[PDB]
Ligand binder design. Structure first.
Ligand SMILES: [Mg+2]
Lengths: 258, 119, 164, 138
RNA sequence: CAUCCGGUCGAUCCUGCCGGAGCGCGACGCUCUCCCCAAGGACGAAGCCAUGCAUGCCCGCUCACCGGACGCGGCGGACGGCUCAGGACAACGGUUGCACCCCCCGCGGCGGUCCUAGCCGGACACCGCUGGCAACCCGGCGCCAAGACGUGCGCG
RNA sequence: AUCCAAGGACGGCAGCAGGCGCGGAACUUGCCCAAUGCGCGGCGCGCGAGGCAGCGACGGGGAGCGCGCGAGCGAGGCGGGCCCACAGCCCCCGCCGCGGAGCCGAGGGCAAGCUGGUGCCAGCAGCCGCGGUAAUUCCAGCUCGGCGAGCGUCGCGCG
């Protein structure tokens, strides 16, 4: 048993969806604690070197970050291993590139370019309501954020809209049947659909039944269901409408692209 | 002299690095990269460029590589692997010292106490 | 550990369970003579490939016609076989695959296409020419005798533009 | 019929096979442990020892030698096959001794011999019988 | 990628074993033109060790020398790497829980403190003089620095 | 187990190389942090982690010792490129141009036969068996067969 926490991470043990080459090396970046966890995040360096290709090595990323050339939720970050998660805001004013981090159908991270009208807020999921010191109510979110004195109408599992400049709630979408959702966990990551039914088993998980826009139906547990508006998404989403094609169609598309 | 036609591919702008990304392929069914520098310069100072990755395919017909055009020399001076600078006509390379002797010196120094500038 | 430990590797051929069998020896020698084969490991490689194709075809054939896996795998296998030219274009049923033989594999070798184009005097002459680097498959010169040529490049195998 | 065939009878089948599989001579000799302790070679491919004496329906006397294994200190006899190799072995010479084709059992008409000599002073017997190398150092 | 052959007899059919024929793991012998990939003191000695190396860095504290020394202080050294001795309802693998728990860095919040505040007090390090002992090790006196130590203004 | 100016002091390579012993059995006392990451810290430092090279028939893959009645082409050396932290190495370019196969066996299983020796001796032989004067099986020559830069022997597991 290791006498303390773990500071390394073998490349072969890294999450599958990060898409890291087997021969790249023995080691891989180790994300640091922050807004999101290890298995629900991705480091900055991977976005800035293996995707956008603005850097070729660790050193270039170090210089770019320490020069303060990237903003996260309106705040410059200088850690190459800082974790980037879901429904976050990515801005690079030098090239005027604004992205919101969402999930693709295949179950991997993607950058959705956006406008200036909606980059001042983010959507977050509320999953804990509790009493703090002196008995003052609080709440928490999927990005490790705490807000004091919320409205009583807000309950757990809901979704909250908050300005980037100020962490003040603007509007909240309830968790109810007939609302569009985005799956964010397991075999169905990235699929968009509307709720149809809710079944609860005492002392265990709660299962949600949704129907895609084209009629496909699927299930998952309530721990990975995210609300994105009332019958219509509040934010801009990737080109495809959360439709997971079959193997035949993907093979056809690959053949066309080749 | 078969005229050597050279292209540019995967061109990207790097205002963060103040440089321009480039993939260059040269068709010589070549002048040791020096003339390729001029050719890339005309495609996109001639000394604000550096060429590092250059391989020759089987048969020698096709050769592809990567470029790197910097806005000004100071940006290059700041952003450039040191050994690349030595390979290019940028700086002189001082005679390196073996790390073994450095390690021995460090250990001996760690041995002595107080003022150890003697060794 | 070193990164070299993760490099995969496997063999590519098999040896007959009964070695000394006169008909097999004579047939193998005859095939070497008609294809000018160096040693007997090439025939073993060919049999390995043929066995893989046959096993895949069998497994797909046991399944129902409307099986999604059956459709996918059969389509991929047929596409590969056709692009290689081993199987005729007019055939698109998995059943025909079981009737393939190593000779069809040999006919698509570089020496084969070289000879049937009348570009060479013989299989041995073709091999010796291939070694000296006088041949430009597609637009690229190739010095591998066992290089297999696809349909789209058979019309494009020429003499090296650099050879004397 | 004779054997059990009920749907809830796997335990009995496992026990029966476990008990009855000890009846095979080969399985016994391989998994019992007696042979490994009684074998002077202790499961090794071949051993290094020291020779100490030369001796030898068919009526042909076969040439062999008495040896003592360095790591074991028990005595055995190993038989030098190739012609003219008696003279190539001298008393008190280091040798390497392996086994015949049949593990454990005697081979051929030779009584009480179950090993072979394959090296003397570090030179392969085959390499010397064909004159490839020479034993001028000993 | 569902294979068999020789041996009990004066001859024949069986049971039954012996031997042969293939693959892989290692050791031994012989031999070896070219390229690519690539394991490598584990095999009842977790036996014994010369030699050399494997953990440093720096944001605070400069009347040190001409700021680089040094030392106080902070972070880290509990990660990484070697091996498989021990241990057989244990470890380990899948699946639950803490409404019986602890948790550095980091992220987000919160921040009300009972009874000289234009800024408090004394030390030690390095260092100067003086010295012990083969070596390892330290002693005594002496002014001086803190995001160090101590006290501490304040809406319970 | 070590040093001692004999009163005292000091150690734990199952970390990287190296050495003794053991065994059938296993490599350089090399260079560098440029890459992948870790600690500290702003325009960097350090890392026997890690990378590069050296030995290396554990082993795996791709070519070759000719085709033809004359031309061509390898390996090999000399120089320039490219690559590399520096050097190699692959590959490209000009000049001169080393063509080399062994290990088993020939009664059956099991594909593959001519003289001279010896005489139940010497030896072969996984089994059956040969050798007591043609020895189709030993020792040599010729011939022939198998695989092939690999071949054979020993022990273990699967079949
Ligand atoms: Mg008080």
């Amino acid at each position: 048993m290791a006498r303390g926490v773990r500071k390394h991470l073998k490349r072969l043990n890294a999450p599958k969806h990060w898409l890291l080459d087997k021969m790249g090396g023995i080691w891989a970046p180790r994300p640091t604690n922050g807004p999101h966890g290890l298995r629900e995040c991705i480091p900055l360096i991977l976005i800035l070197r293996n995707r956008l290709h603005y850097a070729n090595t660790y050193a270039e990323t170090s210089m770019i970050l320490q020069d303060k050339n990237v903003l996260i939720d309106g705040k410059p970050r200088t850690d190459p291993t800082f974790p980037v998660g879901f429904m976050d805001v990515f801005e690079i004013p030098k090239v005027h590139k604004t992205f919101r981090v969402l999930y693709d159908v295949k179950g991997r991270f993607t950058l959705v370019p956006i406008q200036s009208n909606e980059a001042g807020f983010k959507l977050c999921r509320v999953q804990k309501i509790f009493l703090g010191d002196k008995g003052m109510p609080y709440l928490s979110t999927h990005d490790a954020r705490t807000i004091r004195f919320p409205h009583p109408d807000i309950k757990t599992n809901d979704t909250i809209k908050i300005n980037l400049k100020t962490g003040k709630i603007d509007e909240w979408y309830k968790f109810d049947i007939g609302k569009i959702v985005m799956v964010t966990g397991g075999r169905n990551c990235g699929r968009i659909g509307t709720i149809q039914a809710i079944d609860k088993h005492m002392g265990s998980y709660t299962m949600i039944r949704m129907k895609d826009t084209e009629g496909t139906e699927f299930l998952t547990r309530l721990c990975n269901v995210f609300v994105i508006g009332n019958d219509s998404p509040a934010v801009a989403i990737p080109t495809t409408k959360g439709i997971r094609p079959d193997i035949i169609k993907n093979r056809e598309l690959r053949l066309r692209s080749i | 002299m078969p005229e050597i036609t050279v292209k540019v591919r995967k061109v990207l702008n790097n205002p963060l690095l103040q440089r321009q990304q480039c993939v260059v392929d040269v068709l010589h069914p070549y002048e040791s990269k020096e003339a390729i520098k001029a050719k890339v310069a005309q495609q996109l100072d001639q000394k604000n460029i550096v060429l590092y990755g250059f391989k020759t395919s089987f048969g020698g017909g096709h050769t592809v590589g990567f470029c790197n055009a910097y806005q000004n020399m100071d940006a290059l001076m700041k952003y450039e692997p040191g050994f690349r600078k030595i390979r290019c006509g940028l700086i002189e390379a001082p005679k390196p010292v073996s790390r073994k002797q450095l390690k021995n010196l460090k250990n001996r120094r760690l041995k002595k106490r107080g003022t150890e500038k003697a060794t | 550990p070193r990164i070299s430990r993760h490099r995969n590797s496997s063999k590519t051929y098999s040896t007959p369970k009964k070695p000394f069998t006169k008909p097999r020896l004579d047939a193998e020698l005859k095939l070497c003579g008609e294809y000018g084969l160096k040693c007997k490991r090439e025939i073993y490689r060919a049999r390995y490939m043929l066995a893989k194709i046959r096993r895949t075809a069998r497994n797909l054939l046991t399944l129902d016609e409307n099986d999604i896996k059956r459709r996918f795998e059969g389509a991929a296998l047929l596409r590969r076989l056709h692009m290689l030219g081993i199987l005729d274009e007019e055939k698109d049923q998995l059943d025909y695959v079981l009737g393939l033989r190593i000779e069809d594999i040999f006919k698509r070798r570089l020496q084969s296409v070289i000879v049937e184009s009348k570009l060479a005097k013989s299989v041995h002459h073709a091999r010796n020419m291939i070694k000296a680097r006088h041949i430009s498959v597609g637009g690229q010169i190739v010095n591998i005798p066992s290089y297999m040529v696809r349909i789209s490049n058979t019309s494009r195998v020429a003499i090296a533009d650099t050879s004397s | 019929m004779s054997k059990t065939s009920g749907l809830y009878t796997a335990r009995k089948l496992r026990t029966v096979r476990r008990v009855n599989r000890w009846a095979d001579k080969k399985y016994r000799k391989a998994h019992l442990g007696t042979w490994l302790k009684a074998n002077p070679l202790e499961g090794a491919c071949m051993a290094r020892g020291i020779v100490t004496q030369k001796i030898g329906p068919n009526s042909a006397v076969r040439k062999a030698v008495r040896v003592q294994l360095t790591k074991n200190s028990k005595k055995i006899t190993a038989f030098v096959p190739r012609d003219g190799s008696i003279t190539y072995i001298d008393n008190n010479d280091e040798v390497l001794v392996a086994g015949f084709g049949r593990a454990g059992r005697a081979v051929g008409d030779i009584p009480g011999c179950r090993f072979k000599v394959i090296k003397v002073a570090g030179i392969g017997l085959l390499a010397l019988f064909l004159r490839k190398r020479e034993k001028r150092a000993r």
